[PDB]
Amino acid sequence: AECKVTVDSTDQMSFNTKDIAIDKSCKTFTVELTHSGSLPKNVMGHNLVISKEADMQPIATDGLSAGIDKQYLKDGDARVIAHTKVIGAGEKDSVTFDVSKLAAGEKYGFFCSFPGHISMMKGTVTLK
Amino acid sequence: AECKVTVDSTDQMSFNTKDIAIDKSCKTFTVELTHSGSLPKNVMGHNLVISKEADMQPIATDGLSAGIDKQYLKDGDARVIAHTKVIGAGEKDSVTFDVSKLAAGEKYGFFCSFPGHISMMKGTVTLK
Ligand SMILES: [Cu+2]
Ligand SMILES: [Cu+2]
């Protein structure tokens, strides 16, 4: 199906969508993240992380101390389904993953793990 | 003498001053912080923190983990001379401190410890 989405993240700490819908007829799904505005990654960086909805805040908390060099994610965090790098204004990244990782009957979300951003920057992923 | 100052902070991630001059006649000093613009504290909150210049980045890095409930400052941080709360648009806070705490010959600075702000939001405090 349509197996790719592009999400913008802003200088006002927001993603420009609240839901990522994944059609089940995709073996592989690609999320592209762009960052508009002009703020660099060390002041207003953003990544996009996909996990179980319950796991979003715990992943964020463990990422706090990993720092920007590890994309604010604890190295090898198994709760993470897929993630982009932390990007600043002007940059882009994408991550492609097996849609098969998303166990049906489960609730998944996406979020930014840059410290403090999760409170505003999260949404749902919906398998259809 | 004149032993108080008012500093504004903005949605554009700036203080409206780059130096806080403190008169030696002042046995105590009062810093008022205001926030103009319309962004809530969880997207563009600001505080004002005074410390030795050497300590500004290490303080901010420790603040990341402390969270907004701790004003993004490690609790009881010994390097912090004085600080306000994190305020959002429309709010105000002030902090008074003993000018005796500022060691003669040392270099001091003020910054915001809200995640990622420090690069944009710092200045000097001049003991005169
Ligand atoms: Cu972010
Ligand atoms: Cu700030």
Curated annotation (Swiss-Prot), chains A, B:
Residues bound to Cu cation: H46, C112, H117, M121
Top-level taxon: Bacteria
Matching Gene3D superfamilies: Cupredoxins - blue copper proteins
CDD domains: Azurin (cd13922)
Keyword tags: Copper, Disulfide bond, Electron transport, Metal-binding, Periplasm, Transport
Intracellular or extracellular location(s): Periplasm
SUPFAM superfamilies xref list: Cupredoxins
Principal place of residence: periplasm
Limits of the Plastocyanin-like domain: 1-128
GO molecular function terms noted in the UniProt entry: copper ion binding; electron transfer activity
A GO term from the CC aspect: periplasmic space
Disulfide bonds: C3-C26
NCBIfam families for the chain: azurin (TIGR02695)
Function of the molecule: Transfers electrons from cytochrome c551 to cytochrome oxidase.
Protein name: Azurin
Taxonomic lineage from the root: Bacteria, Pseudomonadati, Pseudomonadota, Gammaproteobacteria, Pseudomonadales
